[PDB]
Design an enzyme around this catalytic site. Structure first.
Site, PDB file in Angstrom:
ATOM      1  N   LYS A   1      -6.193   4.226   8.658  1.00 30.33           N
ATOM      2  CA  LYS A   1      -5.298   5.170   7.997  1.00 30.33           C
ATOM      3  C   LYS A   1      -5.875   6.578   8.025  1.00 30.33           C
ATOM      4  O   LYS A   1      -5.183   7.541   8.375  1.00 30.33           O
ATOM      5  CB  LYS A   1      -5.025   4.713   6.564  1.00 30.33           C
ATOM      6  CG  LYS A   1      -4.146   3.444   6.497  1.00 30.33           C
ATOM      7  CD  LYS A   1      -4.061   2.886   5.085  1.00 30.33           C
ATOM      8  CE  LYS A   1      -3.124   1.673   4.998  1.00 30.33           C
ATOM      9  NZ  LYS A   1      -3.302   0.979   3.685  1.00 30.33           N
TER      10      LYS A   1
ATOM     11  N   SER B   1       0.800  -1.221   0.000  1.00 29.71           N
ATOM     12  CA  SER B   1       0.000   0.000   0.000  1.00 29.71           C
ATOM     13  C   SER B   1       0.838   1.280   0.000  1.00 29.71           C
ATOM     14  O   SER B   1       0.266   2.370  -0.085  1.00 29.71           O
ATOM     15  CB  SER B   1      -0.953   0.009   1.207  1.00 29.71           C
ATOM     16  OG  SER B   1      -0.244   0.194   2.411  1.00 29.71           O
TER      17      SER B   1
END
Length: 189
Positions: free
Chosen positions: A137, A94
């Site tokens: 996140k 990611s």
């Protein structure tokens, strides 16, 4: 807050998560020799993350061969890429867009937009693929003072699964290709 209040050229803020929650991370890059180039990588990176650095490295060179064919920086220079803190194990794909951005930022001598963070897997041609941990996140980015967050287009439902009090007051960009990230990270290029 977070490790860098202001990021110099070659440093980009990314995001991570574990079962304990979300966090911010900074990809760092640097020359290791003065100006066939190479990339050395450190930061207890797992196999999948090391591959994403290789993919990001190839894509960043291809992207620079277009946007600025006169700039051979990535093609000739010897670069070191690091993801602090040194002892923390990290894995997954990611941070690919983060790594492309760090490499282009270093090669142009230009910092990225401040208070920006991003997450997203990058493919060899620069497509941005969905990742996990959008909730964690996003919450960690907010807590760190991030005002602009870049997410894969296919994580859009994930983002709007969050309660509005989390997402309001956040400039968010949903992107399908790295070129969109470039325009956000580097508005004056």
């Amino acid at each position: 807050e977070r490790m860098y209040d202001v990021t110099p050229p070659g440093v980009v803020m990314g995001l991570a998560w574990t079962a304990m929650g979300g966090s911010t991370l900074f990809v760092e890059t640097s020359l290791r020799r003065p100006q066939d180039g190479s990339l050395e990588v450190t930061g207890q990176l797992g196999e999948v993350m090391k591959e994403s650095a290789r993919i990001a490295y190839t894509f960043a060179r291809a992207f620079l061969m277009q946007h600025a064919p006169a700039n051979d920086y990535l093609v000739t220079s010897h670069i070191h890429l690091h993801v602090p803190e040194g002892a923390t194990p990290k894995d997954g794909p990611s941070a690919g867009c983060t790594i492309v951005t760090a490499l282009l930022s270093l090669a142009m001598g230009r910092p990225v937009r401040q208070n920006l963070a991003m997450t997203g897997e990058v493919s060899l041609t620069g497509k941005i693929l969905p990742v996990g941990g959008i909730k964690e996140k996003t919450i960690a980015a907010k807590r760190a003072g991030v005002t602009c967050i870049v997410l894969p287009a296919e994580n859009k439902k994930d983002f709007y699964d969050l309660a509005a009090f989390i997402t309001e007051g956040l400039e968010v960009h949903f992107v399908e290709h790295y070129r969109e990230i470039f325009d956000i990270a580097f508005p004056d290029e």
